[PDB]
């Protein structure tokens, strides 16, 4: 386990710079309209805006977190919950993406974590934006994160009429579709649209499968193309999503092979597809690695999309954000019961199921609870701050005996946590501590 | 089924007024510091502030909703989702409470629906406030909803230190406790506190049981009283909660009988209890009625707490808010599949599991989906607006065949819905239409 990968970050920022005579390290230009000098400056500017203190570690990731947590414990109360946000891990994930797949430009899925510093860093690094609502389109455009609305893909296969109207008025063009009734809607409200056909995937192995709601089945792509030509809709490409948190390499290879068949079928209707969107699903934390996935996708892209006439894009969400956040919660209350002399040790922490831990229900997450300064193992039950007995993050499981004032550290909490969190009982985690694990800004 | 109970509202506002020579209809004064004239005016003022249009119906509740929905369908889009909030049903629930239990003053549980108009109407009607966080205490005090901080009960048996400090600085006194470690905390941060001991209940029959996390077991009340006398903490009463959505009349009777035993045990330590808090659990919608529950609680309160020296209070949340709201969602998208020629009819509506329908998971709710203008029964699947396949409110169940533009009406959506709702994918229901089913303000 490693706290940082400094070597990749150095190579990423060097690429296309005057120090290497504006030379790229592959047949692909660097992601983004900015030059290598402009891109490094834009990233440092974001780091300044959010007062990011550079904290470097070789230390494991857990050790890096335990050490930074002890440092950060001492407009908020001393015992309030908080997030340590490592914006260096975001930068590093972009460096890791470029090194593995320079043929694929990443379009950040805003839905995973719409934190303004995360959107700003990714904009400055050359990433595009994947928006699913008029609210998401507005938070990218209103903060000047894209040089053109062509850098936004509206990846929601089923959209409300007012959203189709608002994306058209905004200049948004690339819009997802997977059903005949949606083709008609796009033709009416987005006349200047560049339609991208989303197809069904073998997503059974994913943490969160989505073929149940989205993705045109292969046998139905025929009638969908038919309707696009009919309503004068321009089909410019094909997209897919193998499910969020999918380690199945075979599902990525199988989806690109199926997407190639759609490119063929599209010619017969008057469409020359120029965009292949491979969606998300990539892991964001350190058995399947992102490298193993990239290794199996690279040859298939060379085999069927290595002609040079098509642009290859992706929509990673979790990949960029998961490892960036660590949650710190104070154990402020406790009581002991008798098991039906066995004793249950119940504790109460200032975050839980209604807020950051909603991921236990919506994301099928299983976060790791680290006792900050680890005591005998007791049958422990841990609750959130709300008045609900359902707000429980751990029920009757062995865990070292804790005391009031102790802290719980939960790393890898940057994806599908605060993005879906509510404010039930009036509890929220508002204190943010911005750090950078990578050397980049002096 | 009835759309309103006008007769109860008329009797409620008449009680204690000059029209009846300031006479109450029982040995109990009306709830609140306001006179009957001041109370009726304060309610009408709230109705003016929120532009409440009086809409009267004899019509069933479903018929009243179907008719008002057709009227309201024609800064928002025409197809946007919305809530019709009947503030008259709130007033009526307070009238129904007074008629059934005048010996019990209701302290609204803010957690169930902290909508500012709901808090304002209930403040003007004489209700107290049940707060669980410093945020909840602040939204009551900052909006001037109580004449004194004695009208707030801090009903969270386990509180953060910064919350104990903030309630003390605010003048909040009545605070819940159920464990020895919490007694010590109250003694330190809330020295001016009037402690209320919360006891365990036979809540197995409740929709949402909470004895797992809260409520001192009977055998442990002895050591809890012992610790209160020890840390110089004033035990002024006993509270309980039979679980949210509990129709078990025997659980209310059993909890009052158990609360009487605690009043006895408290004498031995130097405490004369003066407050009996019977919590929540009461139904808010029209097999167990609120009347049947009140009928079984009244005799037990006369038997053990009919001496006249103790004040009896409650903390209803769902009771006051559930029937006040109706949710309207537009069916904006659709696709058909083949069942594994059987066809699945999938639809997409502009509210779901991440927002208003979180209650399906946290509240064990089973809302009623009414097709506005009801078609053959098809195997239907209905989804929310987010990109998640998990955001599903109905999976493969018979339902009349729908078309785009149709509306779904979901009545009884006023409790544990918008109060716990997040903003995942950037979708929220913001349009509110304020109506009153009861005659009260000209």
CB spacing of A390 vs B420 below 8 angstroms? no
Nearest Cα neighbor of B318 from B179, B113, B58 is: B113
| B176 and B286 share one domain | yes
- Rounded to an integer, what distance in angstroms lies between the CA atom of residue A190 and that of residue A9? 40
| B216 and B261 share one domain | yes
Q: Is B366 annotated for ligand binding?
A: no
CA A69 to chain centroid, in Å, comes to 24
Q: Which of B320, B350, B384 is the last residue of a domain?
A: B320
- Rounded to an integer, what distance in angstroms lies between the CA atom of residue A208 and that of residue A408? 27
Strands B407-411 and B370-371: antiparallel
Q: Which of B303, B320, B337 is the last residue of a domain?
A: B320
- Rounded to an integer, what distance in angstroms lies between the CA atom of residue A272 and that of residue A287? 39
Give the residue carrying structure tokens 């036979």: B202
DSSP bridge partners of B205: none
Is there a domain that residue A139 lies in? yes
Whether the CB-CB separation of B416 and B318 falls below 8 Å is answered with yes
Encoding tokens for residue A382? 């841990």
Residue A372 exposed, middle or buried by CB count within 10 Å (0-12, 13-18, 19+): middle
| B217 and B334 share one domain | no
B214 min Cα distance to partner chain A (Å)? 8
Catalytic residue among A158, A170, A236, A387: A387
Encoding tokens for residue A290? 């992102």
CA A103 to chain centroid, in Å, comes to 19
| B262 and B382 share one domain | no
- Does residue B382 sit in helix, strand or coil? strand
Interface of B with A in 253-272 (CB under 8 A): none
Q: Which of A302, A321, A340 is the last residue of a domain?
A: A321
Contacts 24+ apart (CB under 8 A), B262-268: B262/B197, B262/B199, B262/B221, B262/B238, B263/B238, B263/B310, B265/B221, B265/B222, B265/B225, B266/B197, B266/B225, B266/B235, B266/B238, B268/B225
CA distances from B122 to A154, B306, B439 (A): 44, 27, 17
What 3 state SS string does chain A have?
CCCCCHHHHHHHHHCCCHHHCCCCCCCCCCCCCCCHHHHHHHHHHHHHHCCCEECCCCCCHHHHHHHHHHHHCCCCCCCCCEEEEEHHHHHHHHHHHHHHCCCEEEEEEHHHCCCHHHHHHHHHCCCEEEECCHHHHHHHHCCCCCCCHHHEEECCCCCCHHHHHHHHHHCCCEEEECCHHHHHHHHHHCCCCEEEEEECCCCCCCCECCCCCCCECHHHHHHHHHHHHHCCCEEEEEECCCCECCCCHHHHHHHHHHHHHHHHHHHCCCCCCCEEECCCCCCCCCCCCHHHHHHHHHHHHHHHHCCCCCEEEECCCHHHHHHHEEEEEEEEEEEEEECCCCEEEEEEECCCCCCHHHHHHHCCCCCCCEECCCCCEEEEEEECCCCCCCCEEEEEEEEECCCCCCEEEEECCCCCCCCCCCCHHHCCCCEEEEEECCCCCC
When scoring B115, B134, B160 by the number of chain A Cβ atoms within 10 A, the one with the most, hence best to mutate, is B160
| Chain A nearest-CA residue for B111 | A425
**What is chain B's alpha carbon radius of gyration, rounded to the nearest angstrom?**
23
| B395 and B311 share one domain | no
Encoding tokens for residue B418? 């918008």
Q: How many angstroms separate the first and last alpha carbons of chain A?
A: 27
- Write out chain A residues lying below 8 Å of B208, CB-based: 388-390
Give the residue carrying structure tokens 């154990």: A331
Its domain, for residue B131, covers: 87-320
Nearest Cα neighbor of A365 from A407, A327, A406 is: A327
CA distances from A257 to A34, A104, A294 (A): 33, 16, 15
Q: What angle do CA B65, B70, B73 make, to 5 degrees?
A: 115
| B292 and B209 share one domain | yes
Q: How many angstroms separate the first and last alpha carbons of chain B?
A: 27
Interface of B with A in 38-77 (CB under 8 A): 77
Is there a domain that residue B30 lies in? no
All residues at 6 or more sequence positions from B20 whose CB lies less than 8 Å from its CB, including other chains: B14
CA atoms within 13 A on the CB side of B206: 23
The structure was resolved to a resolution in Å of 2.3
CATH number at residue A251: 3.20.20.10
Q: What is the DSSP letter of B244?
A: B
DSSP bridge partners of B410: B327
Whether the CB-CB separation of B384 and B351 falls below 8 Å is answered with yes
Nearest to A132 among B155, B156, B425 (CB): B425
Q: With residue B195 as reference, give the H or E element that holds it.
A: strand B194-198
Q: With residue B432 as reference, give the H or E element that holds it.
A: strand B431-436
| B314 and B346 share one domain | no
When scoring A335, A344, A346, A351 by the number of chain B Cβ atoms within 10 A, the one with the most, hence best to mutate, is A335
Nearest Cα neighbor of A121 from A64, A49, A54 is: A49
All residues at 6 or more sequence positions from B99 whose CB lies less than 8 Å from its CB, including other chains: B8, B11, B12
Nearest Cα neighbor of A354 from A406, A411, A326, A393 is: A393
Encoding tokens for residue B268? 């031995």
- Does residue B162 sit in helix, strand or coil? helix
Nearest Cα neighbor of B402 from B368, B431, B436, B373 is: B373
Whether the CB-CB separation of A405 and A330 falls below 8 Å is answered with yes
Technique used to solve these coordinates = X-ray
- Rounded to an integer, what distance in angstroms lies between the CA atom of residue B283 and that of residue B176? 23
- Rounded to an integer, what distance in angstroms lies between the CA atom of residue B157 and that of residue A333? 9
| B331 and B214 share one domain | no
Note whether B136 contacts A: Cβ–Cβ < 8 A. yes
Q: Is B34 annotated for ligand binding?
A: no
Q: What is the DSSP letter of B362?
A: H
Q: Is B243 annotated for ligand binding?
A: no
CA distances from B41 to B21, B31, B124, B142, B299 (A): 18, 15, 9, 21, 35
Handedness of CA A197, A202, A207, A212 (dihedral sign): positive
CA distances from A3 to A43, A64, A66 (A): 21, 6, 11
- Rounded to an integer, what distance in angstroms lies between the CA atom of residue B252 and that of residue B282? 10
DSSP bridge partners of A378: A399
Catalytic residue among B170, B208, B236, B387: B387
Handedness of CA A293, A296, A297, A298 (dihedral sign): positive
- Write out chain B residues lying below 8 Å of A212, CB-based: 389, 392
Helix, strand, coil percentages, rounded to 5, for chain B: 35, 20, 40
- Rounded to an integer, what distance in angstroms lies between the CA atom of residue B202 and that of residue B377? 42
Between helix B87-100 and helix B290-305 the angle, nearest 10°, is: 40
Handedness of CA A301, A302, A304, A308 (dihedral sign): positive
| B292 and B168 share one domain | yes
Encoding tokens for residue B67? 């008719």
**Number of domains present in the structure of chain A:** 2
| A339 and A294 share one domain | no
CB spacing of A362 vs B385 below 8 angstroms? no
| A315 and A355 share one domain | no
Whether the CB-CB separation of B247 and B205 falls below 8 Å is answered with yes
- Write out chain A residues lying below 8 Å of B353, CB-based: 362
Is there a domain that residue A289 lies in? yes
CB spacing of B79 vs A155 below 8 angstroms? no
Note whether B156 contacts A: Cβ–Cβ < 8 A. yes
Whether the CB-CB separation of A299 and A316 falls below 8 Å is answered with no
- Rounded to an integer, what distance in angstroms lies between the CA atom of residue B47 and that of residue A196? 50
Whether the CB-CB separation of A216 and A200 falls below 8 Å is answered with yes
Encoding tokens for residue B17? 């007024």
CATH number at residue A410: 2.40.37.10
Interface of B with A in 364-423 (CB under 8 A): 383, 385-392, 404, 419-423
Whether the CB-CB separation of B355 and B384 falls below 8 Å is answered with yes
Note whether B204 contacts A: Cβ–Cβ < 8 A. no
| A329 and A317 share one domain | no
- Does residue B303 sit in helix, strand or coil? helix
User: For this structure, is B387 an active site residue?
Assistant: yes
């Amino acid at each position: 386990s490693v706290a940082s990968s400094q070597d990749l970050v150095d190579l990423f920022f060097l690429e296309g710079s005057q120090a290497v005579d504006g030379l790229c390290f592959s047949p692909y230009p660097i992601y983004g309209w900015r030059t290598a000098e402009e891109r490094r400056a834009a990233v440092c500017e974001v780091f300044k805006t959010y007062n990011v203190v550079t904290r470097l570690p070789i230390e494991t990731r857990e050790q890096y977190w335990r050490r930074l947590s002890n440092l950060y414990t001492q407009a908020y109360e001393p015992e309030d919950p908080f997030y340590i946000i490592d914006l260096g891990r975001v930068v590093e994930q972009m460096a890791r993406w470029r090194h593995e797949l320079p043929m694929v430009r990443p379009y950040f899925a805003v839905k995973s974590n719409p934190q303004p510093a995360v959107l700003e860093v990714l904009s400055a690094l050359g990433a595009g934006f994947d928006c699913a609502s008029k609210e998401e389109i507005h938070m990218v455009l209103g903060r000047q994160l894209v040089a053109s609305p062509d850098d936004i893909i509206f990846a929601n296969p089923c959209k409300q009429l007012g959203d189709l109207r608002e994306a058209q008025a905004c200049g948004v063009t690339y819009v997802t579709v997977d059903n005949p009734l949606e083709m008609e809607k796009i033709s009416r409200l987005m006349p200047s649209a560049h339609a991208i056909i989303r197809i069904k995937t073998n997503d059974s192995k994913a943490q969160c499968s989505f073929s149940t709601k989205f993705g045109a089945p292969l046998e139905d792509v025929e009638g969908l193309l038919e309707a696009a030509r009919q309503f004068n809709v321009t089909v410019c490409g094909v997209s897919f999503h193998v499910g969020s948190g999918n380690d199945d390499q075979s599902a990525y290879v199988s989806a690109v092979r199926d997407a190639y068949q759609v490119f063929q079928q599209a010619v017969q209707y008057g469409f020359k597809c120029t965009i292949l969107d491979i969606g998300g699903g990539f892991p964001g934390t350190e058995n399947t690695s992102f490298e193993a996935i990239a290794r199996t996708i690279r040859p298939v892209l060379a085999e069927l999309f290595g002609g040079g006439d098509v642009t290859i894009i992706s929509e990673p969400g979790r990949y960029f954000t998961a490892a960036s956040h660590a949650l710190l919660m104070n154990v402020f209350a406790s009581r002991t019961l008798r098991l039906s002399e066995p004793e249950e040790y119940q504790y109460y922490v200032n975050d839980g199921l209604y807020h950051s831990f909603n991921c236990i229900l919506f994301d099928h997450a299983h976060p790791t609870l680290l006792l900050l300064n680890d005591r005998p193992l007791r049958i422990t039950t841990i609750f959130g701050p709300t008045c609900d007995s359902m707000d429980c993050i751990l029920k009757k499981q062995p865990f070292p005996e804790m005391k009031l004032g102790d802290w719980l550290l939960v790393p890898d909490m940057g994806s599908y946590t605060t993005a879906a969190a509510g404010f039930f009982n009036g509890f929220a985690t508002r204190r943010l501590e911005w750090v950078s694990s990578v050397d980049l800004c002096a």
